[PDB]
Amino acid sequence: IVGGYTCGANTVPYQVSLNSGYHFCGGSLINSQWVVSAAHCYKSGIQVRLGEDNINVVEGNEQFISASKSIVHPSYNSNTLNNDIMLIKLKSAASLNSRVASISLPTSCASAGTQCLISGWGNTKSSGTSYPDVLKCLKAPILSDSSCKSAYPGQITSNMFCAGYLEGGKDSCQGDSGGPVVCSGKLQGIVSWGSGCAQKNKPGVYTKVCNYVSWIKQTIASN
Numbered sequence: 001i002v003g004g005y006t007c008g009a010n011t012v013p014y015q016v017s018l019n020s021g022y023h024f025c026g027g028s029l030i031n032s033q034w035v036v037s038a039a040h041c042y043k044s045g046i047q048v049r050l051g052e053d054n055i056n057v058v059e060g061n062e063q064f065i066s067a068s069k070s071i072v073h074p075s076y077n078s079n080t081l082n083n084d085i086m087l088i089k090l091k092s093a094a095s096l097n098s099r100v101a102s103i104s105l106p107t108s109c110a111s112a113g114t115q116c117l118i119s120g121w122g123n124t125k126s127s128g129t130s131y132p133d134v135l136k137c138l139k140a141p142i143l144s145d146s147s148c149k150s151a152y153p154g155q156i157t158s159n160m161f162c163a164g165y166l167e168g169g170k171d172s173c174q175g176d177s178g179g180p181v182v183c184s185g186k187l188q189g190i191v192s193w194g195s196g197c198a199q200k201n202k203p204g205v206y207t208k209v210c211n212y213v214s215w216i217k218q219t220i221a222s223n
């Protein structure tokens with residue numbers, strides 16, 4: 001997250017860190033046994049880390065649970081990043097509390113101009129590299145589909161939205177991949193892609209979770 005703020009320990013209780021010997025992606029806890037992330041975050045050997053603030057220190061609220069199964073969307077296209085969503089099942093259910101909590105799926109798609117919270121442990125610089133150890137937050141609005149399509153001609157599908165600031169300076173970035181975009185207490189987006197980070201006229205692009213609710217619910221019900 002570039003141009004964000006330190007969230008505060010366990011203030012974003014649905015945030016997870018995907019760990020394969022190191023943090024590599026975010027995710028969102030959607031019930032006691034399932035995480036949603038980006039399909040581009042797929043790999044085998046995932047450990048889900050819940051309750052994290054400093055990903056380098058054991059602070060005492062963590063739960064570390066191995067993935068039993070990963071399901072990448074059947075129509076994910078790694079060239080276009082269309083359908084950039086994946087489900088991870090935990091080997092055992094998480095213990096839910098005020099610091100480890102599920103985030104609700106949306107019943108409605110969020111409108112342009114809605115303010116959302118994006119979070120993650122990704123790079124904090126638009127130029128060069130600085131990875132924070134503690135969770136970073138950013139408040140950003142969803143942009144109109146026309147401003148999103150004008151920023152990324154020929155690249156925005158109906159399964160994507162833009163959020164952020166056309167002026168630059170404030171965005172998600174590498175390492176925030178798979179993390180949540182939460183609006184009005186519902187998961188609306190997944191950190192998916194963008195051109196650089198925090199560049200002028202190049203906002204973040206996020207998977208539009210409201211289009212996937214039936215797939216998520218039917219997948220969870222049968223797996």
Ligand SMILES: N=C(N)c1ccc(Br)cc1
Pocket residue numbers: 171172173174175176177191192193194195196197198203204205
């Ligand atoms: N929001 C962005 N600019 C961004 C997000 C994820 C990745 Br990976 C790269 C760029």
Ligand SMILES: [Ca+2]
Pocket residue numbers: 052053054055056057058059060062
């Ligand atoms: Ca920790």
